[PDB]
Each structure stands twice: as structure tokens, then as C-alpha cells.
Amino acid sequence: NYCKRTPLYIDFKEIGWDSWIIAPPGYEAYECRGVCNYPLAEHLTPTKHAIIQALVHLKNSQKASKACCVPTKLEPISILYLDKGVVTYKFKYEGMAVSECGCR
């Protein structure tokens, strides 16, 4: 359907990264799924370029692609990980969770 944030849980054990990330076992990272339809709604915070490209794609599907539904605001999570055998704590590990989706 329309570009929105949708669930996506990450299990660090199952992706093979518990070798270096002690905590958490996992977290809700979310993802962005859906079509970017012209006109791009305001909550999709479209750039000027995404608006133009979306319009060209409407007129000619071969000259330009649709705007893509991607994360537009990433949020940090807490983490404990190993760095050469050193436990490292970061209350805010940037770029890990999606708070807002949009068209770009």
C-alpha cells in the first residue's frame, strides 16, 4: 500500500552478530514499505528532487523511476559490544531504528 513504517525485528543471534554484540538480544528496527504516489504527501517529507522525479515517472515510466520509500529519520539504540576484547557501552548507537519514513 502507501509508504509507511512497518515492523522489522532484528535478532542478533540469528543474523550472526552476537559474536560481538553482547546486548541486546535484539530490537525493533522497523522498515519502510509502500509505494510513493504522486503527489507525495507532506508527512513523507519529499525533497524537491523526489517530487520532480515522481512527476517525470508518471509521464514516462521509462525516463525516471518512482520515488523510493526509505527511512528518513533514524534513531539510536543502546548497545553493549566487544572491541578487541573490551566491553563498550553506548547509550545511543546512531542510525539503528526507524522513527519516520518518507519518499526520496
Partner: protein, 95 residues
């Protein structure tokens, strides 16, 4: 409290007298390392609610995930949502 999403947690915003304030719905956490009778506290403090990790919803600090294989499976992490719940830890492993 729950309305302002603030929580007091043990510590090994000021970290005065072994406690720390965890705002923005953050939870308590504690990391230990355990091998037979030897248990050592590594770190304590806040765990961000961003990402809503599953086992941080427990009111007690229970280690419910099998420890990582690193350092001979000795690490013991738990996070919890009551005040000073990270003072100690209880185990409930799948193995």
C-alpha cells in the same frame, strides 16, 4: 513514574550514590560475567526504550536469552522496568 516515563536505576543527569535517572522511558540494565561461583558486575545504568528490546519489559532483571558464546558464555545481561531492578539478576536460560 510511568506518566513522565522516568525511572531510577542502579549505577556502578548525575550518577550520584550508585544510582542514575533514566528518562524518556529508558529502563534499567546490568551486565555481569559469571563462571561457576565467580560473579562480577561489569556495568549498570540506563537502556534506551528506542528499539523496544523484548526482555526489557520484565519487572525483574532476568537473563532470559542464552548468553553469547563470547568469553566462554560468561556474560549475563538483563534489563527491566521497575526502579532499582538491576541491583541483582536471576537466570532463565533456554538451555
Amino acid at each position: 513514574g510511568s506518566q513522565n516515563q522516568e525511572r531510577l536505576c542502579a549505577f556502578k543527569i548525575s550518577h550520584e550514590n550508585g544510582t542514575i535517572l533514566c528518562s524518556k522511558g529508558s529502563t534499567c540494565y546490568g551486565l555481569w560475567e559469571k563462571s561457576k561461583g565467580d560473579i562480577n558486575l561489569v556495568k549498570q545504568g540506563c537502556w534506551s526504550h528506542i528499539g523496544d528490546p523484548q526482555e526489557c519489559h520484565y519487572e525483574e532483571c532476568v537473563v532470559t536469552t542464552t548468553p553469547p558464546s563470547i568469553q566462554n558464555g560468561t556474560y549475563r545481561f538483563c534489563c527491566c522496568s521497575t526502579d532499582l531492578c538491576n541491583v541483582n539478576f536471576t537466570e532463565n536460560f533456554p538451555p
